[PDB]
Design a protein around this ligand. Structure first.
Ligand SMILES: CC1=CC(=O)NS(=O)(=O)O1
Ligand SMILES: CC1=CC(=O)NS(=O)(=O)O1
Ligand SMILES: CC1=CC(=O)NS(=O)(=O)O1
Ligand SMILES: CC1=CC(=O)NS(=O)(=O)O1
Ligand SMILES: CC1=CC(=O)NS(=O)(=O)O1
Ligand SMILES: CC1=CC(=O)NS(=O)(=O)O1
Ligand SMILES: [Zn+2]
Length: 257
């Protein structure tokens, strides 16, 4: 089964998921000088004030903070998007070392980690239907660099010991995802895919220009998570990122000059 090890990592995924070599795979390198400023791109509308977080889960590949997506409580609109996309979960990808960890890169630079806020297009009715459509998901990607602590991240970091191993979950109510956003909502956007199997080509990627800073202690605690289940040999959950994939016949657009 797929993962991030030497024998089941990203270079093997195409054998079970041939779309891994498809025409709109993610992540990609964002070449800042080649991205095209599009003055017609609207500002992003991030409406998270009514968000209802529920639970945090170690799924063996990352951890997901899950939200109530049965109503329009936390929605992403605007930018390149038509219609309304509901927040279903967020998760991160991170490295074994501060020098790597992000999935998208910027002029080939790898950040320490990358946050993915996952939203599905409400016109399809649920996430399972949305992933089958070329405009089914909108993922807000936010880079993490190591520096000052991110206060709005600490409640996540502090609960990780309760979900150390694959299959563990914990209550995670009353968490405010607005605390994970940078100041600016300037962004790049392009059509892409899920970055894990099944790698479906259903994502409008919206990658924020401005990273958030997290402390070395915060990212160190991510690296204490385990890919394995309890009672199995310990394998640290680190380097759970897919490398940049060929851009092929796509142009990255920028919301900002
Ligand atoms: C390095 C590694 C990563 C993974 O995803 N699965 S594994 O626990 O078999 O080994
Ligand atoms: C150019 C570049 C290459 C790489 O792999 N990691 S990095 O973050 O040092 O930046
Ligand atoms: C994942 C996790 C993070 C932490 O802070 N302590 S712990 O090593 O018990 O488990
Ligand atoms: C659920 C989900 C799966 C994935 O692989 N990429 S994503 O960031 O769109 O979120
Ligand atoms: C719900 C689930 C199924 C899917 O299609 N992609 S995912 O593996 O990211 O999560
Ligand atoms: C897990 C651990 C335990 C503690 O008490 N303080 S700390 O935040 O430095 O790291
Ligand atoms: Zn992701």
């Amino acid at each position: 089964h797929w993962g991030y090890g030497k024998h089941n990592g990203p270079e093997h995924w195409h054998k079970d998921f041939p779309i891994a070599k498809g025409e709109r795979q993610s992540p990609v390198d964002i070449d800042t000088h080649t991205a095209k400023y599009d003055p017609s791109l609207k500002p992003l509308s991030v409406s998270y004030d009514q968000a209802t977080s529920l639970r945090i889960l170690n799924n063996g590949h990352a951890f997901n903070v899950e939200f109530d997506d049965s109503q329009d409580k936390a929605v992403l609109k605007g930018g390149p998007l038509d219609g309304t996309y509901r927040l279903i979960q967020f998760h991160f990808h991170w490295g074994s070392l501060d020098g790597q960890g992000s999935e998208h890169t910027v002029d080939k630079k790898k950040y320490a980690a990358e946050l993915h806020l996952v939203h599905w297009n409400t016109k399809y009715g649920d996430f399972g239907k949305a992933v089958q459509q070329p405009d089914g998901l909108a993922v807000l990607g936010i880079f993490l660099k190591v520096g000052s602590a991110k206060p709005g991240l600490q409640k996540v970091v502090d609960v990780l010991d309760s979900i150390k191993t694959k299959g563990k979950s914990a209550d995670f109510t009353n968490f405010d995802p607005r605390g994970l956003l940078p100041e600016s909502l300037d962004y790049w956007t392009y059509p892409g895919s899920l970055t894990t199997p099944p790698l479906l080509e259903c994502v409008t990627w919206i990658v924020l220009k401005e990273p958030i800073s997290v402390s070395s202690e915060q990212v160190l605690k991510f690296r204490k998570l385990n890919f394995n289940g309890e009672g199995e040999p310990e394998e640290l959950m680190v380097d759970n990122w897919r490398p940049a994939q060929p851009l092929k016949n796509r142009q990255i657009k920028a919301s900002f000059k």
